[PDB]
Paper text:
At present, the best structurally characterized pLGIC is the G. violaceus ligand-gated ion channel (GLIC), of prokaryotic origin. Each subunit consists of an extracellular domain (ECD), predominantly in a β-sandwich fold, and a transmembrane domain (TMD) composed of four helices, labeled M1–M4. However, the GLIC is a pH-gated channel, activated by lowering the pH, with a maximal activation at pH 4 and a pH50 around 5. We instead found that proton activation is a complex multiple loci mechanism, with the key contribution stemming from the coupling interface between the extracellular and transmembrane domain, with E35 acting as a key proton-sensing residue.
In the lower part of the ECD, the principal (+) face also carries two acidic residues, E82 and D115. E82Q and D115N display significantly higher proton sensitivity than E82A and D115A, respectively. Assuming that Gln and Asn faithfully mimic protonated side chains of Glu and Asp, this would suggest that residues E82 and D115 are also proton sensors. To investigate this idea, the structures of E82Q and E82A were solved at pH 4. The E82A structure is similar to that of the Wt pH 4 structure, whereas that of E82Q shows a marked local reorganization of the Q82 moiety. Assuming E82 to be in a protonated state at pH 4, Gln is not a good mimic of a protonated Glu residue because Q82 is engaged in a completely different set of interactions with neighboring residues. Therefore, the E82Q mutant phenotype is likely due to local side chain reorganizations of Y28 and F156 rather than being a proton sensor itself. There are no significant differences, measured as 5-fold over Wt, seen in the backbone Cα residues of any of the resolved structures, with the exception of E35A and E82Q. The E82Q side chain takes on a different rotamer, causing a local change in the backbone, as well as a cascading rotamer/conformational change in Y28 and F156, the latter of which flips out towards the aqueous environment. All structures were in the apparently open conformation.
Numbering used by the authors:
A (entry chain C), B (entry chain D), C (entry chain E), D (entry chain B), E (entry chain A): 5 to 315
Write the structure that this text describes.
Amino acid sequence: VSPPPPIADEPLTVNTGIYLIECYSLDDKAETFKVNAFLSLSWKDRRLAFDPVRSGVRVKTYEPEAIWIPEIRFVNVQNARDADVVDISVSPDGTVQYLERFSARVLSPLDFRRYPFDSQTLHIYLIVRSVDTRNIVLAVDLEKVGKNDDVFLTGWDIESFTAVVKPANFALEDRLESKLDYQLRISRQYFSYIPNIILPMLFILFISWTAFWSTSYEANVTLVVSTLIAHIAFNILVETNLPKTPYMTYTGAIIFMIYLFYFVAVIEVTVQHYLKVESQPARAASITRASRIAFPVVFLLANIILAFLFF
Amino acid sequence: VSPPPPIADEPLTVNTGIYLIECYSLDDKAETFKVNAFLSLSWKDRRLAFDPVRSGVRVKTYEPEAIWIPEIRFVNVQNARDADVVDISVSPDGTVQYLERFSARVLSPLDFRRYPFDSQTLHIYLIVRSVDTRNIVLAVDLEKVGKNDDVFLTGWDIESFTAVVKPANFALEDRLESKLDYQLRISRQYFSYIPNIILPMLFILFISWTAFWSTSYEANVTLVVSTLIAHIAFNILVETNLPKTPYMTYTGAIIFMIYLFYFVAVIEVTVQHYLKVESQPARAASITRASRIAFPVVFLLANIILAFLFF
Amino acid sequence: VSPPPPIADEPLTVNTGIYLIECYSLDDKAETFKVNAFLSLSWKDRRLAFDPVRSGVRVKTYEPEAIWIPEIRFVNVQNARDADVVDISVSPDGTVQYLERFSARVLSPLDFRRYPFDSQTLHIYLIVRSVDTRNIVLAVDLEKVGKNDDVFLTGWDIESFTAVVKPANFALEDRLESKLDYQLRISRQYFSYIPNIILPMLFILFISWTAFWSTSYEANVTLVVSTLIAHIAFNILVETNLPKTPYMTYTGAIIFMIYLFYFVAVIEVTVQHYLKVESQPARAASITRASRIAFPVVFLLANIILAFLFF
Amino acid sequence: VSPPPPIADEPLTVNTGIYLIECYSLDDKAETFKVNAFLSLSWKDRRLAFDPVRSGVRVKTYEPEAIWIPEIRFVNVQNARDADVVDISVSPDGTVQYLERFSARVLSPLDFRRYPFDSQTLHIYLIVRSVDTRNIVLAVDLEKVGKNDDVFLTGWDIESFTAVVKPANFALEDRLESKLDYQLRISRQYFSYIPNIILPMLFILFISWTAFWSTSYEANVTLVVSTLIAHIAFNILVETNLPKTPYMTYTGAIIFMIYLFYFVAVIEVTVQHYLKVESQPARAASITRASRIAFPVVFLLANIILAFLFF
Amino acid sequence: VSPPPPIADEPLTVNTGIYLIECYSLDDKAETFKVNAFLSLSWKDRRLAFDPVRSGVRVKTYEPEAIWIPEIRFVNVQNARDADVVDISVSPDGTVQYLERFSARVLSPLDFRRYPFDSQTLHIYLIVRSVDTRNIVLAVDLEKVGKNDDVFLTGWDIESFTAVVKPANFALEDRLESKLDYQLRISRQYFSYIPNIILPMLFILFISWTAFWSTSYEANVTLVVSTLIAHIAFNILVETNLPKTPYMTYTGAIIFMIYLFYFVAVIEVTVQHYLKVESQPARAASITRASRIAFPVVFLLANIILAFLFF
Ligand SMILES: [Cl-]
Ligand SMILES: [Cl-]
Ligand SMILES: [Cl-]
Ligand SMILES: [Cl-]
Ligand code: NA
């Protein structure tokens, strides 16, 4: 089968629509999401036209083998979607209404700068390659774009699923390509990060600060070194959940900055001890009293500055 | 092949049944289960009718290619089931009795609020899409709904496998869809959580409390900081087995609360030492004696409050 | 093609045989094993009969598409086996001798009660579903049941591969099913568990007991708390290799019991210190001397009781 | 179908081109990358010749089954690419213009010597095997070689995608093979390695050096042994992200060298203590003062020497 | 199609050859390797004979569907290879020259006794099953056995790829089977094990021995218990890279033996302290001085004995 012939010099408009049935998974490290949805396609093939009077049937159902169908592909996939055709219905003027249910693993990059208080725009880019007989342009049938009520992405809140209705038409290997942008806007459920990472990480930091009410070097060294090791365990945990970014993430900046606080607390504990040993406990007492205020104050101000820079 | 024609204006009733052969797996993190079962379908196709006298045969066996079969799909799947047809038997009036054995990975969300003392209702939603020639409705043949006695889901107890017999009929892309709800009710085998997570986590908490019968700051700091680090190891272990929920789970609440107990025990140990150093051991002795009772009492009362809130 | 017709009212006997080519893998957590074997089937189809004189050929080779073949399936699989037919040979009386080489991932449950000194009976349940024209019964051709000499399951010793020659005949969805039980008896190579888990776990326990020859509370607290943390690391390691069971395993019971020994050792260390501080070192000396004998004696007796209960 | 016949004794030139649509993944441990691209092929088959007068059509579209297509394979793959033909267009003279969209997992080795400041040349080697009727040579159509602007490899910067235009023609099993070298030059985004591994690893090393301002053996032993254990945690983390190389990597050399610094710091701490105990604190004081300068100086010089050797 | 008929009572000789294109991966835990290679087959089918004079063509190319091809399978696989036929060329006498490119995951057991200084013989066992019409024997065409120069197995050195030219002919289910043994001899690149596991493990052992130049029980307990915990971390790391063997490996023996050294060092530290406390420092001083020499001497002699036993 060949594509539909033009009346004038007009391109063939393939109207499209995506209705999500299942999203469910998103892999932050791989920057992929798994989607299962309907892909509806519609175009006019005058060669398939008929009259209700003489034909009897008001609509004709066809097998994909029997008629011409445009080759629609997703841009941002590593493996092409697994499609199963559901229905092909031809109307009197030859308007074909195609429907398939697909499953794909879509490669859409994430911006982790504000992680875990980040929002993302996930994309599904539909594309059609023009043939020598006719140029094929894609369109959006907004009534056939949407999502099922039960669509819930684990660890995320789905805000919208829309389409940039004007295609990106361009040349690629001396043939026109018509690209459409379907956008799934999501925002992270940051909740669990608070009792599991943020508050435990702060509690161990505040425990290292009890060294400012202790004259015992041996105990101080245990407090600051023990909690530093628990901090490294949270840093390793956090960095396993995320990919390696050429920029700093919000959590990454706090995790990094908290090392400097442990480092400076080791210096304070060292200084305090050296002075007691040098028979200067009055000088040591002054530094320790200042540290009791300076460490929480600088921690609160430094975190205000970070939240300002990131949000 | 086209669908069966109606006598009046009646829809085609496709009677369904699911008989589980294997369940075996459930992934809490992914919120999926793997199922292997029989899917029996039955409908009337008058075009396939015959008489026992003239035909000889009392039933006719058909290949799926030879006759019309309704396109039945599962709603809550990422990838469509792998089906193998077992038998297609046509009776005199044209009653088709279809049987397939399928395997699918079903996306069914879990409520972890009471974890690991949680029960779940897993679902398999069957769906049929109506054609232009006829509207297709799904039904439940309760005699063909069940499970094999050897069906055992690892780490769970299967309570029941039933079907919500009245379908959810609705419009989707200007065509009727007939959805059925098959429900597998399960309850978690909470047993192993007790000797592996709950009791080890309590033993290390009770070891931190021996600091209330010690005047040795260095030893106290080791007791409370060491056991806090073993608590973090159990918190990380627990959170790897579960997905990130926008609500608190039962185990998550206990795990979180136990951090506050370690934190307050570090404050007690600090206060006690500061006082001995300030030559106030009588005041420190009073706080330490109160702590011996206050810590277990508040721990028991706080756990009673939690169990009340969650169950 | 239809099934072979009966002479009288006799069912069709499909003789079966499984010859293992590769086993190699068993996953304790998933409770699955991967098998690659020959599946030989044999039945009489009189419609395929011929005479050696007039036909010339003493045996006729057929493609599976050309003749009737019984639909044989495995019960305990999530996904059906991948089969490749090797040969189909028809003898003069119409005796069909079918041979395929398959690969399957079989769901067979394990009893971890005596882990890692456990033995298991793995099963492959063959099943045939009777047709309306004839009832199909399965049989065992013991000469066609066996295993290749090179068949070795990693981490296990294969003891036998036999078949329960009498099928379990029963009704399922108003049709007879004929089930056969192929049993692969295996016993775990418990060796590596000794230098990798058992002896390291005992060495750290015996190191905690050196606290009974020490008056130093600070050192004692380090000995018992440090080794408890290494015990938790072994408990986590062990529980990652096994699934969550609604019963206690042998290793699990020892691992759990050893926590009680650490807990009681923390109590002894606490009591001993409290007494030295209260100026009662003579009383503390008595408890410490008793502990030196009591801890190893109760440990040896408690382990004798466990080994009795489990074996 | 047989291959096109020659006019003279000329080989068939199959012009090739690869246009990358998605790269996205690279696995350092496996030394693989996942690619999704267009593979365009072009050759002359005079047997397929026609012209618009007599045929009507100016170009003829063909199914791959209908015409001869050269068997083009990738050399460096474990599993052959998943190809989907997009278009086959036959011109006047019989010039076939083939286009497929493939997905492959390509095995291309990496040189980790300068890790994580390393650059790599990834390869896709195309190959064609000559037939007895005709020798087949591969060529590069540079206008059909390139990459999409949105092509971004996670954790890397893509520098170029070119082709070594002259094929490597050679004999293999008494038949000519024509190999082409497509090269994807990439450089690692080393950024994240700094706040996540390099700076944390240096902070813990500098904390071990506070032992040079402490006379407390107990505290010193805790400082150096605790931080050594956090160093081992970073060494294990680093070695899990990389494969086992028969050469030293840059990060591996620093990680290894830092062990010698911990070892020598344990010797210093031991020596210092032994002397204080032997009533030689003046000698110990001299060694400790020298160490305060020697450790950072030798660390800075040793790192200059390493950076010199590796870059 | 039927197999070629014999002249006398001679079996059909199927000449074979394997030319490796990619090896690349080997999984020690699974005891598998992934291979991609050419499989060339050659046999005489007199029914396919022709004369160059009358036929014109000097060689005839055939599709696999058109002629008889022997069913060749690999013995040691879980899943059968993915093959793609490259060429089938028939010579005048009817000599068929078949060529396919396959990909397989081969199950070949490894001997870890000398790990990581081990060498292995990996096998690919080809097999053919004789038919009733003719007995089929396999042979080796040594000119068609080899490997590509770019074939490099990550973490290993390939020493040779040869074939045991005489097949293992045997009966299996009353039919002859002809098995060939292709052997890939490899030796491990042990290099990385030295800076990553061996030297770090020795450095922490030598750090525990600094306790023989310390009178400080508290410090000694920290030195030996801390380093024991880092030893357990290396033991767990090593045992995750290897499968559970019913024999001791070289690394496993050293790792195990080093626990006894830690255990005895804890006894020494305990004895030394007990004596100082009992006012016997002269006796304790003697044991500590002996230990300084005894521990390294016994460690060096015990390692010489092990290297002797294993190599
Ligand atoms: Cl390929
Ligand atoms: Cl095979
Ligand atoms: Cl024999
Ligand atoms: Cl034979
Ligand atoms: Na300490």
